[PDB]
């Protein structure tokens, strides 16, 4: 089917440059256009740029005019956005987006977004610690501590365990590094038979940790 | 370009209530307005297009109306799964502009939290730091107080909280409070306890453990 995959996010120093790409699958970019839409943390959606399938009809929002450059690969089904002179206000999740309307109905698709962090800090992979179930139902979890920048994705048993999972929003510590915990409630009947592993992914630092949680 | 003005900014209502959200365009957009829903941590989803038509899969309780400059999104029967932020959008031309968004919260009955305490892991103690986590699970309303006691000494400046968004089915919250100390300062005291007060609890519930048992 249709999928849009953004890549290129991570930390970038203020005043420096960063290149985003969006790979489009399940359709040919031979009609209509492609959009970039960004969302600052806790803020609203903001359309940023558009490009047509043939490179024409390029428009930018006033907030990024003269700094962002949208373009498409003439050889592949991929669109790019070069982002120069980045400032703190540019920190946002950046979504690749495609929308049009036919007699068949609406065609509206979004990537999962990539987080650009405009910061003077360095990238740091996290450490993963188990929240062991101790002395009805029992709760266990994983503490993902001291990482920068966001985000960190956490799953349990490679996504086979979802019910009762609470992965809390990250918290900015005194050190300036992020930390979060993901917890899950299970019946204490299963602590002796079922294995519980949290899968932690920090893409900006190429960190993939599988941590088994034991009583 | 065309400016979109959305209201209200935030609203809370009960299950089954009618929710009304309005958008204004700075100039005529005919009926080229769409309404998007975005839930916590996920990408936006198209709900309404051409002011009034529903995207595939959208429940019938979502409706839209309006033309030219004034448009309205209506949820005829607010459900816990509708807790999200909603955005209007015009698509008259090649670009887009969104409204500021309306966060929709839901009201429900009081639910007391289940409190769990987690001692610091031994691998973190080998790393040189110590974190004590206290978990408040599936409660309403959001307002709660978590007090950290170390040998019955109240703490301040060394704990941080995080709260999930309302659950998509029962609309409760869950909260985590993390007491972060140095390994040297942790191996000092004996008893670590988190005291929790909440409207659903008759008296403050305390979860405690002794260091190294």
């Amino acid at each position: 089917q249709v999928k849009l995959v953004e890549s290129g996010g991570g930390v970038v120093q203020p005043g420096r440059s960063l290149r985003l790409s969006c790979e489009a699958s399940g359709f040919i970019f031979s009609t209509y256009g492609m959009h970039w839409v960004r969302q600052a943390p806790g803020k609203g959606l903001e359309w940023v740029a558009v490009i047509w399938f043939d490179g024409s009809n390029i428009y930018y929002a006033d907030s990024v005019k003269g700094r962002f450059t949208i373009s498409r690969d003439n050889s592949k089904n991929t669109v790019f956005m070069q982002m120069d002179s980045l400032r703190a206000e540019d920190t946002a999740v950046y979504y690749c987006h495609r929308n049009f309307y036919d007699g068949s109905g609406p065609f509206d698709y979004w990537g999962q977004g990539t987080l650009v962090t405009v910061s003077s800090a360095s990238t740091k992979g996290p450490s993963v610690f188990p929240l062991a179930p101790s002395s009805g139902t029992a709760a266990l979890g994983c503490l993902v501590k001291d990482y920068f920048p966001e985000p960190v994705t956490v799953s349990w048993n490679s996504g086979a365990l979802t019910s009762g999972v609470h992965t809390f929003p990250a918290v900015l510590q005194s050190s300036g590094l992020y930390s979060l915990s993901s917890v899950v409630t299970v019946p204490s009947s299963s602590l002796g038979t079922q294995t519980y592993i949290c899968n932690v992914n920090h893409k900006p630092s190429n960190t993939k940790v599988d941590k088994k949680v034991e009583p | 370009d065309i400016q979109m003005t959305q209201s209200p900014s935030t609203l809370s209502a009960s299950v089954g209530d009618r929710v009304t959200i309005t958008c204004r365009a700075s100039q005529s957009i005919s009926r080229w307005v769409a309404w998007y829903q975005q839930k916590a941590g996920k990408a936006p989803k198209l709900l309404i297009y051409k002011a009034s038509s529903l995207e595939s899969g959208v429940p019938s309780r979502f409706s839209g109306s309006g033309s030219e400059t004034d448009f309205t999104l209506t949820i005829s029967s607010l459900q816990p799964d509708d807790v999200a932020t909603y955005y209007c959008q015009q698509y008259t031309s090649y670009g887009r502009t969104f409204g500021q968004g309306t966060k929709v919260e839901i009201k429900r009955t009081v639910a007391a939290p289940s409190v769990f305490i987690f001692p610091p892991s031994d691998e973190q103690l080998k790393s040189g730091t110590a974190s004590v986590v206290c978990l408040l699970n599936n409660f309403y309303p959001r307002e709660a107080k978590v007090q950290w006691k170390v040998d019955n000494a109240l703490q301040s400046g060394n704990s941080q909280e995080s709260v999930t968004e309302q659950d998509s089915k029962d609309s409760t919250y869950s909260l985590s409070s993390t007491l972060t100390l140095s390994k040297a300062d942790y191996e000092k005291h004996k008893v670590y306890a988190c005291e929790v007060t909440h409207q659903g609890l008759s008296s403050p519930v305390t979860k405690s453990f002794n260091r190294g048992e």
């Binding site: 256009g33 309307y101 | 090649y94």
Partner: peptide, 6 residues
């Protein structure tokens, strides 16, 4: 008329 429609 609309560039995103038909």
């Amino acid at each position: 008329a609309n560039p995103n429609v038909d």
